[PDB]
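Hypothesis: this fold can be encoded by more than one sequence.
Test: take the structure tokens below, design a sequence, compare later.
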């Protein structure tokens, strides 16, 4: 599951994913994170 720190970061993550880029590369590029669970924390609410 991906969790993003702001709405900007989420929007940038979604563009990064359009060509098929790995989630892990899009995470370091945007500041979003990948967790094994389904419950994003409050500081990664977007």
């Amino acid at each position: 599951t991906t969790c993003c720190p702001s709405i900007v970061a989420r929007s940038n993550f979604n563009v990064c994913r359009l060509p098929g880029t790995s989630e892990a590369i899009c995470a370091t590029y945007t500041g979003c994170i990948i967790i094994p669970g389904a419950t994003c924390p409050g500081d990664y609410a977007n």
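The first helix runs from residue 7 to 17. The radius of gyration is 10 Å.
Hypothesis status: open.
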